[PDB]
């Protein structure tokens, strides 16, 4: 039945991504005094189906003519890693329970950059290669803070096991303990997912389409699905890490509802941010991380090391 | 006479410094912009349900040209060619011959809707209120040739839209 | 075997989609459509590496907090963090952090 569980994790996540697209469109429209897609189906519920079918039936252009193996691997790697990163998350029981699921997710996120790295290069264009390079720098720059902030907050968890986060936050959300870290981590998620105001990679206003400028029809759809799946997964990781939920062992449905609602709130926050702010300049993006954030994260890491010792609140290892 | 944008000096008192440090660290202005967007989210959208809902227009609207007739049914245009002269894009081609009844009528009246600029001239020049840009705006065509109107097409448009055109002229004829 | 199964299933699903998106829509009949500067700012990438090394060195800290010699552990942890901060400060002050 384990394969059944794998499918139950995979297909609903893809459907959620498809409808997250519609949700984004409608929310952005309403914050711009507009109405989202509503002609295609009741209240626009059938729009993602139309979008997908239109994309698939569309011409498969491919002037890459260089390392087509890479030009095909990049979408595969992106989608596969986006689906895999969902596996260790405890909602409330994880599909795969790892002692170090957190470091596993960090490694998978680091790997997922290779999808953008290769796609842009195998495209063998101008915007594609330079845009891919800007991507590497962006994700790489925020990966540092992501790890430090994650280590700082888990110092209270006592392990890298995602499941124990529920136990640690049983009485209070960890945001109350580490809100500065929470803010920096949220911005870090935004940067890692390449979302506005850090949507420099794609960067349509500046780069025609970025790394996916030479990707069309299905491969572009897979990149879109990977992007949105990463958005939902990172927001779910935020919800588990900071906005903990009550878990009744006999009725997991309550925790599942609470967790889903919090992740939806965070994704809506992502769309809200995309609507509000303009895009940070490539240079300003790095200035905000290495020169502004990296320091405060180091100080807070020292503090979160020191606090359990000086407050005798060292969490149990098991 | 002149006003200085910017040109303001921040206070250096500890309270003001603390406030600005809070703004930088706690992202207050970003939160204000976020709240503005949230309020706009909860405001009613301005979209009209086209085609079921149509945008407002005034009686002086300038759309598809339409040759009109007298109440008797005789075509108003009297081959003055004044419209062709004022036409700023030379989209009007007029040919006339004395008709069998002996009246001065147009054998050819072509308005190239692909060269016309919808200036509103001719409508204000025709001494007999013949060519009058109708209220219709949704007359897109699938081929270029359909937009090269003929006198028959113009007269058919006038017959089709006369009910609205007469009312609009009645509304606006006093302002002219 | 569970983790191996998950990896296999995900990879196969993604590759299956890539197949149905690279070859299946490629059948549809059509016609003919015809169709770097040396980045010295790569220093940022290199600095990421040496900082990622400290990242790795710092990961054992949650289990390091479980020792009985908490004094020595705390001193060494703050030593590593202060050395990282010193490295960042040095690169900052020497204009080495010339991003873009």
């Amino acid at each position: 039945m384990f394969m059944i569980n794998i499918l139950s994790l995979i297909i609903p996540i893809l459907l959620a991504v498809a409808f997250l697209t519609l949700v984004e469109r409608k929310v952005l429209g309403y914050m711009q005094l507009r109405k989202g897609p509503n002609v295609v189906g009741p209240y626009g519920l059938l729009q993602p189906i139309a979008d997908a079918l239109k994309l698939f039936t569309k011409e498969p252009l491919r002037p890459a003519t260089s390392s087509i193996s890479m030009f095909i691997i990049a979408p595969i790697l992106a989608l596969s890693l986006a689906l895999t990163m969902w596996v260790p998350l405890p909602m409330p029981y994880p599909l795969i329970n790892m002692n170090l699921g957190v470091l596993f997710m960090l490694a998978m996120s680091s790997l997922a950059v290779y999808s953008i790295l290769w796609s842009g290069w195998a495209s063998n264009s101008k915007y594609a290669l330079i845009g891919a390079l800007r991507a590497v720098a962006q994700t790489i720059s925020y990966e540092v803070t992501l790890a430090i902030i994650l280590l700082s907050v888990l110092l209270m968890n006592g392990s890298y096991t995602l499941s124990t986060l529920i136990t640690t936050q049983e009485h209070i959300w960890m945001i109350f303990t580490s809100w500065p870290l929470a803010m920096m981590w949220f911005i870090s998620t935004l940067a890692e997912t390449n979302r506005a105001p850090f949507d420099l990679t794609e960067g349509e206003s500046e780069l025609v389409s970025g790394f996916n400028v030479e990707y069309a029809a299905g491969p572009f759809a897979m990149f879109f699905m990977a992007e949105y799946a990463n958005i939902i997964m990172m927001n779910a990781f935020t919800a588990i890490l900071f906005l903990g939920a009550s878990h009744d062992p006999h009725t997991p449905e309550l925790y599942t509802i609470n967790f889903v609602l919090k992740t939806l709130a965070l994704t809506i926050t992502f769309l809200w941010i995309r609507a509000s702010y303009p895009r940070f300049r490539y240079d300003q993006l790095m200035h905000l991380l290495w020169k502004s954030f990296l320091p405060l994260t180091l100080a807070l890491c020292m503090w979160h090391i020191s606090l359990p010792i000086m407050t005798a609140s060292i969490p149990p290892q098991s | 006479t002149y006003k200085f944008v910017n040109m303001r000096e921040p206070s250096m008192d500890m309270k003001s410094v603390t406030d600005r440090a809070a703004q930088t660290l706690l992202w207050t202005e970003l939160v204000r912009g976020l709240g503005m967007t949230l309020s706009y989210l909860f405001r009613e959208p301005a979209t009209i349900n086209y085609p079921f809902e149509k945008g407002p227009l005034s009686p002086r609207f300038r759309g598809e040209h339409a040759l009109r007739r007298y109440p008797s049914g005789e075509e108003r245009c009297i081959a003055c060619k004044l419209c062709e002269a004022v036409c700023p894009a030379q989209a009007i081609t007029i040919e006339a011959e004395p008709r069998a009844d002996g009246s001065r009528r147009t054998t050819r009246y072509d308005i190239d809707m692909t060269k016309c600029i919808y200036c509103g001239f001719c409508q204000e020049a025709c001494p007999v209120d013949a060519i009058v840009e109708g209220p219709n705006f949704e007359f897109s065509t699938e081929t270029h040739e359909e937009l090269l109107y003929n006198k028959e097409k113009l007269l058919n448009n006038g017959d089709k839209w006369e009910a609205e055109i007469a009312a609009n002229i009645q509304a606006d004829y006093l302002y002219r | 075997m569970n983790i191996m199964l998950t990896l296999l299933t995900n990879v196969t699903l993604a590759s299956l989609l890539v197949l149905i998106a690279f070859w299946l829509p490629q059948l549809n009949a059509y016609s003919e459509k015809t169709s770097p500067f040396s980045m010295k700012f790569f220093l940022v990438a290199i600095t990421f590496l040496l900082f990622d090394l400290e990242i790795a060195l710092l990961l054992p800290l949650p289990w390091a907090s479980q020792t009985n010699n908490l004094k020595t552990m705390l001193t060494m942890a703050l030593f590593l963090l202060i050395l990282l901060a010193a490295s960042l400060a040095y690169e900052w002050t020497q204009k080495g952090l010339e991003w873009a």
Binding site: P295, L296, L298, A299, L300, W303 | L25 | -
Partner: peptide
């Protein structure tokens, strides 16, 4: 005296560094 001036300038121009150094010192 001059230390207070340095602290005021630092908080006005580089508040993040001031916060980081304070937290690390504590």
């Amino acid at each position: 005296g001059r230390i207070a001036s340095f602290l005021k300038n630092a908080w006005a121009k580089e508040p993040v560094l001031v916060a980081s150094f304070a937290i690390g010192g504590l």
